[model samples]
Target: SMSVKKPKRDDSKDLALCSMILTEMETHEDAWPFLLPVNLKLVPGYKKVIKKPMDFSTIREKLSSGQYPNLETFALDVRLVFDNCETFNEDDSDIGRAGHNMRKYFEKKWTDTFK
Candidate 1:
């Protein structure tokens, strides 16, 4: 008789907000470097430095799977993409600049949407 769990409210709304934020980030001009997993062929050392490489495509799949329990969990993956880029690239390099630009863009959107 205790098997039924109460349906949680606000999840749908939160998910929609996540979707909107992700869409904006994906369309950003600086999103090129993060659109997919880093090419191991191009940067053979990437896997060594970034143990858990995150990308927009992977995030999109996780979002579709409904695996993220909340916005914070989703944000972690998004931040990981930028964090990994910083780990493996020089701050002044093109890819690093793109990562920083994308992070700033994402943070602004996050603040505007949920903060």
Candidate 2:
């Protein structure tokens, strides 16, 4: 038995955004300052480990309760969530690549937003 509550990221939205980043967006290099049709409200955090320090639950709770001083920091924090993901660690999974690239897209978006 287990009990845990997490301030979850909107996975449906992330998946849609991920798909858009990988397929619909024709070119990203030139797509600076891109407009996001979806919101990054519940973007994942930088913690993947569950014990000893740094984990999803902790990150989620902190972010959900905390406020960002600037949009740049906020966006960056959102990007931190999916930092270097393997997408279930499968073989030649398009979904994996899509997730990786989408994270990059958002990373660029953060940079673009500042420019």
- Top-lDDT candidate index: 1
Q: lDDT per residue, candidate 1, 1-115, as tens digits?
A: 3988787555558888898899998898889998887887887788677789899999999999988988999999999998988998899999989989999999998998777
Candidate 1's TM-score: 0.87
TM-score, per-candidate, Cα-based: 0.87, 0.35
Off by over 4 Å in 2: 1-66, 87-91
Q: Report, for all candidates in order, the number of backbone clashes.
A: 0, 2
| lDDT of model 2, residue 99 | 49
Residue pairs clashing, model 2: 44-81, 45-81
State the local distance difference test value for candidate 2.
0.40
